[PDB]
């Protein structure tokens, strides 16, 4: 129920690793954002200097978040597709953090990964449909926007349109073709809600990586776990705390009992946790083999 | 619900 029991022996990465290898920790949920893909060459929104909010000057937006809003997209799709061309990677290589989630899957620990990312890197690392909720959709497929058509197009097709600087139009009806992303103002997919309803009844650990927990309703997922479920944040800075004026993360107050912040690069935090678990060699070998295979494409 | 900032 809603008791605040303390299941970690200490509020440290070391405590989390011990908990993970106890009989009580069977079901792990990962919640991830753009911070897990910055080291794969895709900027986030909020990192100073490198984040997209500091690099939209030449688009002359009323404000930086407009290029990611559905109202603006529907009026003028060209800016978005121009930015898509600028950001599109020549190679899709998942990070150490992505492969740490692949290990959770392979060790039988991963109940679900909920991602805010649209970059497909979770799929490339080996997470399947049983494993993954793409809360904000994906670039992997695209669809015609006309309700009477809705023809689907693969990423190879969308990539060619983006690089040619031709606004993508449907071959069957000549309507706009839109990547399967959830823009600000659009509804999330049905499975986000069905997974959320089921998964958070029975979660033993919540692992939050590379997110500022500022987009809703995704950010509210932290509050859906049972009150005794430990929560580990791996991130460059603390995030998810309740605002002093406005369930939230409590790392540091006198009443802290289950939330742990490991501050640094997601890749470094995952490597550190892997090492405590006895998984460091497995993670190293996995990453090197998968990266080598990607480099060989 | 909808995606909001
Ligand atoms: N890769 C993508 O698919 C992609 C790219 C850009 C934006 N987005 C959207 C961004 C939006 C909000 O997500 P959110 O992730 O909170 O973005 P955000 O930009 O608000 O926050 C990113 C968080 O990650 C932190 N961070 C960045 N890099 C690292 C790193 N290497 N290691 C540890 N921490 C890091 C950063 O300090 C911040 O707290 C989502 O809806 C995404 O769809 C996605
Ligand atoms: C909600 S905040 C999603 C808006 C879409 C963000 C797009 C991120 C940049 C596109 C990078 C292309 C990767 C294939
Ligand atoms: Zn069509």
Two tokens at A115?
């991602």
Superfamily (CATH) of domain A1-38+95-135+190-297: TPP-binding domain (3.40.50.1220)
Find the DSSP H helices in chain A. 13-20, 70-75, 78-87, 96-106, 121-125, 155-164, 190-199, 266-277, 280-295
Q: How many CB atoms lie within 10 A of CB A211?
A: 26
Q: Experimental method used, please?
A: X-ray
E strand spans, A38-146: 110-115, 132-134, 137-144
Q: Is A55 annotated as a binding residue?
A: no
To the nearest 10°, the Cα dihedral for A82, A83, A89, A90?
20
Two tokens at A50?
């490198």
Residues 6 or more apart whose CB falls under 8 angstroms from that of A193 comprise: none
Under 8 Å between Cβ of A78 and A86: no
Q: Which long-range contacts (CB under 8 A, 24 or more apart) does A180-183 make?
A: A180/A137, A180/A138, A180/A139, A180/A140, A180/A141, A180/A142, A180/A143, A181/A118, A181/A136, A181/A137, A181/A138, A181/A139, A182/A135, A182/A136, A182/A137, A182/B3, A183/A68, A183/A69, A183/A70, A183/A73, A183/B3
- Between strands A205-209 and A28-32, the pairing is parallel
- In DSSP terms, A67 is beta-bridged to none
Record the resolution, in angstroms: 1.8
Is A240 in a helix, a strand, or coil? coil
**Ligand 1 midpoint to CA A45 (Å):** 6
Per domain, the residue ranges of chain A are 1-38+95-135+190-297, 39-94+136-189
Q: Best substitution site from A31, A45, A120 to test ligand 1's pocket, by max atoms within 8 Å of Cβ?
A: A45
In angstroms, the CA A95 to CA A294 distance is 12
Q: Which of A62, A211, A216 to mutate to test the interface with B (most CBs of B within 10 A)?
A: A216
Under 8 Å between Cβ of A139 and A158: yes
**Ligand 3 midpoint to CA A74 (Å):** 16
Superfamily (CATH) of domain A39-94+136-189: SIR2/SIRT2 'Small Domain' (3.30.1600.10)
Residues 1-5 of B with CB under 8 A from A: 1-5
How many Cα atoms sit within 13 Å of A81 on the Cβ side?
A: 22
In angstroms, the CA A175 to CA A168 distance is 8
- State the residue for tokens 């290589």: A93
């Amino acid at each position: 129920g809603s008791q605040k029991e303390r299941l970690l022996d200490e509020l440290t990465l070391e405590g989390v690793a011990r908990y993970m290898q106890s009989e009580r920790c069977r079901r792990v949920i990962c919640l991830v954002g753009a911070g897990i893909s910055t080291s794969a060459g895709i900027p986030d929104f909020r990192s100073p200097s490198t984040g997209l909010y500091d690099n939209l000057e030449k688009y002359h937006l009323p404000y930086p978040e407009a290029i990611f809003e559905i109202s603006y997209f529907k009026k003028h799709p060209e800016p978005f597709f121009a930015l898509a061309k600028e950001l599109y990677p020549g190679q899709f290589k998942p990070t150490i953090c992505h492969y740490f989630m692949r290990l959770l899957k392979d060790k039988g620990l991963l109940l679900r990964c909920y991602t805010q990312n649209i970059d497909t890197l979770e799929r490339i690392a080996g997470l399947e449909q049983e494993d993954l909720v793409e809360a904000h959709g994906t670039f992997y497929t695209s669809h015609c926007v006309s309700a009477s058509c809705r023809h689907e197009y693969p990423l190879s097709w969308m990539k060619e349109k983006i690089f040619s600087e031709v606004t993508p139009k449907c071959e069957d009806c000549q309507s706009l073709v839109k990547p399967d992303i959830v823009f600000f103002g659009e509804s999330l997919p049905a499975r986000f809600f069905s997974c959320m309803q089921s998964d958070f009844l029975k979660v033993d650990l919540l692992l939050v990586m590379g997110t500022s927990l500022q987009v809703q309703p995704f950010a509210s997922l932290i509050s859906k776990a049972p009150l005794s479920t430990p929560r580990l944040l791996i991130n460059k800075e603390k995030a998810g705390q309740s605002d002093p004026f406005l369930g939230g993360m409590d790392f540091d107050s006198k009443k802290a009992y289950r939330d742990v912040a490991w501050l640094g690069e997601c890749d470094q935090g995952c490597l550190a946790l892997a090492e405590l678990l006895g998984w460091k060699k497995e993670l190293e070998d996995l990453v090197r083999r998968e990266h080598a295979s990607i480099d060989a494409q | 619900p909808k995606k909001t900032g």
